[PDB]
Nucleic acid binder design. Structure first.
Lengths: 261, 177, 61
RNA sequence: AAGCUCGUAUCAGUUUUAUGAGAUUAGAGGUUCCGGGGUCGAAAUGACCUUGACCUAUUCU
RNA sequence: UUGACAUUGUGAAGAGACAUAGAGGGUGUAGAAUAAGUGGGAGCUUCGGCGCCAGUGAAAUACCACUACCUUUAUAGUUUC
RNA sequence: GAAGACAUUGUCAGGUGGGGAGUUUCACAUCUGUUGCAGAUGUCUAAGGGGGGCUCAUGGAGAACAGAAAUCUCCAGUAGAACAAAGGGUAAAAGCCCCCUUGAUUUUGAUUUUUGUGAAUACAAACCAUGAAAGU
């Protein structure tokens, strides 16, 4: 209350560390407690975020989840007290999802791991390049709760990554969501999750498919029209030469006419 | 003002009091002001600048660029002067840490993250195409402005307040507020 | 001052008869025992028919 | 009700004349790589086993 | 019912704070070692102990500046209890 | 005897006080809660001008891989196409493509919708775009 009893906090963080070592489940009482104290603002310190990092890097599922939900809660200020976020994300993606393919986590937990990885990556300009092929298995409309997965796909995109590994993603989505015969919600979800990719990685889809997607402006369904207008207004301010003359809306065209001579 | 001139004059005289440590003392400006909280994302970034950093740059390039910049007095590299380096993290980190900055051709800023990916992006010296003062987490911010030119100090100060005590310093000299 | 509905609503977080007792939902239930009644003017004639006595022949399609 | 500009001819509960204005795949099989059971597997993205959902050919407009 | 003022005078001893002047500090792991952090860089040298070049580490140590926190030393006075 | 600068007493200021008084009775849709909700994010809220060229939807016949749908050629086709889902209007266009521009510009008054504006409407002077031009 008055002043932070460092002699006490530093002592009762050591027991959390020495609980998380015991690999059965006993770090539950460290994670559940450190989350409470962070929420009450009593343990705002660099020493504590390491505990939840180690929990996220643990083998027990209910401890890993406590760590992941701590670092989630859009993320919290604890990211700004990490020691190496890039190596953290690399170790997570290597241990849990891809490395051994132990298949311990269910889909509801895999999605929460994906959310954390993508939201760290987009925020801190990280580079892993395995993410973008791991998503492709799950990017199918016949898959369980894909609107969460594709909303994290965009969150791992940058201005500073090779756009080919995102081109393959966009061409998977385009092949499987805005193809022939697909439904209105499916096509609208595809276009909406592509334009919010291109808002971070603009040169990740080329003009030839950009035009194929702005085809769907006057689509009579009111989902695909609202979606295509967003892509058009996105590339009207960024790369309006990829768009055709029909779409450059009275100022992009005037800016191009003066700057083309 | 010319209250900068009296400061810089006997700084240049301190130039000739403890003369030489057999190098050249660069000039620096340290910014101190309050009223902002960087733990919230109040971020700033601006690169509208022009020095003498004992220029040590490493350009990556092609045949068209390596024999362009063999002149110039510059360290240069092939693409497979980089391809045959990924096997050793501390090796690819030592070149990371060697040079003050990095540049590369317009072709190789698609391939450089596959090779020098984790490094060279958090370090804040990622290359830039050819043919900074980031408010990351702290209130403290120092920038190297020049060498042993009173204009440059004000030139940078108006830009910093443009973006938003002031101190000027040399390598071992004292502080002048 | 602490025993005021204003202060109660402030410290905690509309219908006639909401107190420390008897929230919204409860007042409506307890009004059922009384106001299944028939409204009239002063001279005497129906303004508002009783509940479940509207007396309008709908379009039954 | 009290009046005040003046006493034209304009008016009219009327007429005349012209003229406009959804559910069905049983029958075949492929997948779920998040649902995995089965003899087996130090070890295995298997022989096959079913729950399935999936892509299908049907019917009305 | 609890607080302030007044009635309300004569004495004493203690604790806390304003306000200045100071003084020092940092173990998750690895690393010689207990790394706030940031920025300049490869000696002022009593020693050339050393700083650079060498690991290990997100971050590298001399030398000199910046401006964050934490803990303590003294009472011109200031007051409160 | 006790007690003592406290209690008390006086004035202010918070709290309690039905004991008592007076009185009333614009949008599809991933992201947090109540139940299948009101709320929070982000996401739509929209290219007009004047010149030229050309006809659309659909069907039939026909061509290696090529099939009901990939590209090509011919015939029919008053609109069955498109123009922000059974409706009016539009076919050398009011539609698609192409060329040039950005009159979606200022000043002076007039009319209808409407006393308040806005909206649309025509009207003249200038700067302008367009086409060879009429003219817009």
């Amino acid at each position: 209350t008055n002043g932070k009893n460092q002699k006490l906090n530093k002592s009762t963080q050591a027991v959390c560390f020495n609980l998380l070592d015991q690999p059965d489940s006993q770090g539950i009482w460290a994670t559940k407690l450190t989350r409470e104290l962070w929420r009450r603002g009593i343990w705002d310190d660099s020493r504590t975020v390491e505990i939840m990092t180690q929990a996220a890097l643990h083998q027990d599922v209910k401890i890993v989840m406590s760590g992941v939900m701590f670092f989630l809660d859009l993320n919290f200020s604890a990211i700004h007290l990490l020691r190496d976020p890039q190596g953290f994300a690399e170790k997570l993606f290597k241990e849990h999802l891809s490395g051994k393919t132990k298949n311990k986590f269910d889909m509801e937990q895999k999605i929460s791991l994906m959310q954390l990885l993508s939201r760290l990556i987009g925020t801190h300009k990280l580079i892993v390049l395995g993410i973008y092929t791991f998503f492709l298995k799950y990017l199918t409309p016949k898959q369980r709760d894909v609107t969460r997965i594709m909303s994290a796909c965009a969150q791992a995109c940058h201005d500073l990554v090779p756009p080919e590994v995102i081109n393959v993603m966009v061409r998977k989505i385009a092949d499987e969501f805005v193809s022939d015969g697909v439904a209105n919600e499916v096509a609208a979800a595809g276009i909406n999750t592509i334009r919010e990719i291109c808002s971070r990685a603009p040169l990740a889809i080329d003009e030839i498919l950009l035009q194929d997607l702005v085809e769907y402006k006057g689509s009579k369904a009111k989902g695909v029209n609202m979606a295509a207008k967003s892509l058009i207004a996105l590339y009207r301010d960024v790369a309006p030469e990829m768009l055709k003359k029909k779409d450059r809306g009275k100022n992009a065209a005037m800016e191009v006419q003066e700057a083309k001579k | 003002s010319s209250q900068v001139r009296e400061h810089v004059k006997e700084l240049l005289k301190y130039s000739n009091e403890t003369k030489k440590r057999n190098f050249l003392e660069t000039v620096e400006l340290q910014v101190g002001l309050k009223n902002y909280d960087p733990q919230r994302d109040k971020r700033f970034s601006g690169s509208l600048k022009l020095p003498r950093p004992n220029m040590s740059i490493c350009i990556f390039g092609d045949a068209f660029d390596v024999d362009r910049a063999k002149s110039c007095g510059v360290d240069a590299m092939s693409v497979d002067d980089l391809k045959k380096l990924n096997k050793n993290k501390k090796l690819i980190k030592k070149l990371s840490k060697k040079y003050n900055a990095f540049i590369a051709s317009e072709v190789l800023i698609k391939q450089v993250p596959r090779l020098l990916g984790p490094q060279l992006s958090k370090a804040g010296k990622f290359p830039t195409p050819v043919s900074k003062f980031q408010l990351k987490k702290v209130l403290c911010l120092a920038v190297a402005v020049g060498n042993v030119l009173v204009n440059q100090i004000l030139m940078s100060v108006n830009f910093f307040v443009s973006l938003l005590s002031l101190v000027v310093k040399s390598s071992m000299g004292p502080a002048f507020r | 001052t602490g025993k005021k509905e204003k202060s109660r609503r402030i410290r905690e977080g509309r219908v006639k008869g909401e107190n420390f007792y008897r929230d919204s939902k409860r007042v409506k239930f307890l009004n059922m025992y009384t106001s299944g009644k028939e409204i009239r003017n002063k001279k005497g004639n129906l303004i508002r028919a009783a509940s479940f006595q509207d007396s309008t022949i709908p379009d039954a399609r």
